[PDB]
Ligand SMILES: C[S@@+](CC[C@H](N)C(=O)[O-])C[C@H]1O[C@@H](n2cnc3c(N)ncnc32)[C@H](O)[C@@H]1O
Ligand SMILES: C[S@@+](CC[C@H](N)C(=O)[O-])C[C@H]1O[C@@H](n2cnc3c(N)ncnc32)[C@H](O)[C@@H]1O
Ligand SMILES: COc1ccc2c(c1)[C@]13CCCC[C@@H]1[C@H](C2)N(C)CC3
């Protein structure tokens with residue numbers, strides 16, 4: 001029907017989960033139709049056009065930590081996790097994911113480590129705890145996040161953690177690091193070529209860079225509506241600020257760094273992640289509503305924020321589970337400096 | 339049946355074209371089964387293993403030119419050509435291919451141009467004729483090829499052509515070039531990382547490198563038998579000396595050069611190329627046998643050489659036409675120096 005109509009029913013909670021899932025799945029299906037070309041010749045033409053376009057491109061309210069704790073796993077990881085079993089808990093999946101990054105980024109005790117867009121600092125705290133001679137720096141644009149990480153470090157008796165409060169695109173420093181990690185942050189970068197260039201200036205010849213990003217296995221796209229029938233994309237990200245690179249897109253951004261290894265993690269891991277958050281939010285729904293009320297001012301504003309987050313999870317499930325995780329998934333790459 | 343048995347019937351010309359095509363198609367089908375993995379995770383693991391393996395790797399009889407002229411097109415191009423129409427002739431398809439390379443490599447009058455593994459020099463002669471202020475150098479490991487090119491240049495009143503006689507892997511020079519072209523030569527390179535490094539030392543900051551190579555669109559493989567049922571691979575290349583890179587494989591070889599653009603050409607163009615050579619050889623069969631007899635010594639040795647070349651064409655047809663050209667095809671990349 002009308003977008004305004006669907007949006008209305010959604011906010012009133014009049015769309016059941018089955019219908020909601022069905023509608024979002026169909027939106028993603030149309031994206032697949034948009035992205036897949038009939039020949040590899042056409043596929044590469046499409047993909048290179050996107051990559052060329054990238055090379056031309058040059059807040060106030062934050063959720064309380066108590067709410068984040070009620071919706072996300074123990075370390076409030078806000079990125080795809082890794083689920084060995086169907087019964088793996090979100091807390092276990094956070095730890096597994098942290099361990100996977102440490103292996104693939106070849107973290108060793110004694111290294112200086114920078115985590116770019118470190119969020120609530122789960123990975124920073126993991127590395128700091130596991131490798132006592134490492135010196136781990138998180139970089140975040142959120143004062144609330146910085147404060148949370150430093151508190152957790154204090155509680156965990158960690159003395160090897162610091163946090164830089166900065167917009168990474170504006171941050172200037174002569175400091176270099178043995179390891180730079182970027183976990184699901186590059187999706188938010190307006191200018192990737194300049195981003196990778198900046199990162200290279202923070203590396204020495206001995207450094208490694210590890211990037212993890214949501215991807216599609218074949219093509220790239222901005223997270224935005226194709227047509228007027230897509231109410232979902234703009235509801236979730238009202239800004240044109242998220243890019244879903246193809247699994248191979250970063251191979252074309254080796255001006256300043258050199259690839260050493262490349263992996264993908266099947267989308268069912270991400271699907272199980274957002275499912276876990278959705279289920280946990282649902283379980284703690286009453287508590288969540290109570291926590292949010294002070295800072296939001298009305299029970300209607302609370303309902304709005306919850307609907308947004310819950311829909312993000314329901315939609316993410318359809319996206320990443322599509323074709324048993326073989327459409328949208330997570331890409332990982334390891335680089336050295338050129 | 340037995341490989342020795344099939345080889346026996348083949349040499350006696352007792353295998354009809356239909357059976358021959360069917361047998362070779364089945365061999366290529368098994369390669370597809372070998373190369374395609376069930377998940378992108380597994381596909382990338384497979385592909386990166388191949389790319390890592392590459393990074394660890396560190397004659398007497400030539401066909402008379404008269405024979406080559408009887409089998410190949412006018413400029414004796416020995417690489418995939420480009421066929422606009424079903425009725426495009428091989429001579430037209432050679433020229434079209436030459437033009438495509440000139441466009442994609444951004445050839446401009448006045449440039450110094452190096453063609454690595456230039457063969458019988460069709461592209462060298464094309465650029466020299468079209469761009470009178472260019473200075474075009476072909477590099478070949480064949481004295482016969484060098485002699486052929488220089489004769490043709492003399493006949494065509496070209497004064498802007500030279501030929502280096504060298505094994506490119508051994509060639510040392512301080513000379514740089516505005517444009518370096520590599521047309522279906524990298525498939526023969528034992529050590530690609532060192533090859534690309536060497537090429538970079540022959541470039542300035544203003545240079546471009548253009549590489550064209552046979553590929554598969556998804557995976558890489560050596561041109562060799564998977565199993566004991568494959569009589570074809572070792573008959574065509576009795577040496578383990580040809581590598582079929584995936585369409586994206588060279589993206590992982592940007593230590594010394596930086597990608598600017600990337601294309602593929604659908605495999606039907608290659609299929610139509612080998613078909614044209616096969617048909618022309620068939621037409622000039624009597625003449626070919628006469629030409630070859632002096633230098634081969636026996637009518638049996640002649641038959642052997644012809645069977646080899648003809649089978650190469652029949653097999654190439656099945657390979658490149660597989661799934662309407664959407665399996666094996668031609669990859670092209672444009673690079674600048676790092
Ligand atoms: C999807 S979250 C991932 C967070 C964390 N790496 C994790 O795995 O939980 C991406 C993070 O990048 C941060 N971010 C976005 N743009 C940024 C910028 N310009 N400078 C610094 N951080 C930024 C966001 O605030 C967010 O915390
Ligand atoms: C498939 S042919 C392509 C020839 C030509 N570029 C064309 O398009 O017709 C590849 C060429 O590379 C040459 N070649 C192979 N190894 C070489 C080496 N080490 N040095 C120089 N040329 C080499 C072969 O002799 C052959 O002429
Ligand atoms: C369900 O799949 C998705 C889809 C989009 C997004 C995510 C996950 C993230 C995890 C949760 C917080 C927001 C994140 C953001 C957008 N970035 C780009 C990646 C991880």
Ligand SMILES: COc1ccc2c(c1)[C@]13CCCC[C@@H]1[C@H](C2)N(C)CC3
Nearest residue numbers: 416417418522525552580612654655
């Ligand atoms: C029919 O498809 C093929 C398959 C293999 C090969 C070819 C074409 C070439 C053209 C003809 C001369 C030999 C060439 C050699 C091997 N190189 C690697 C590429 C081009």
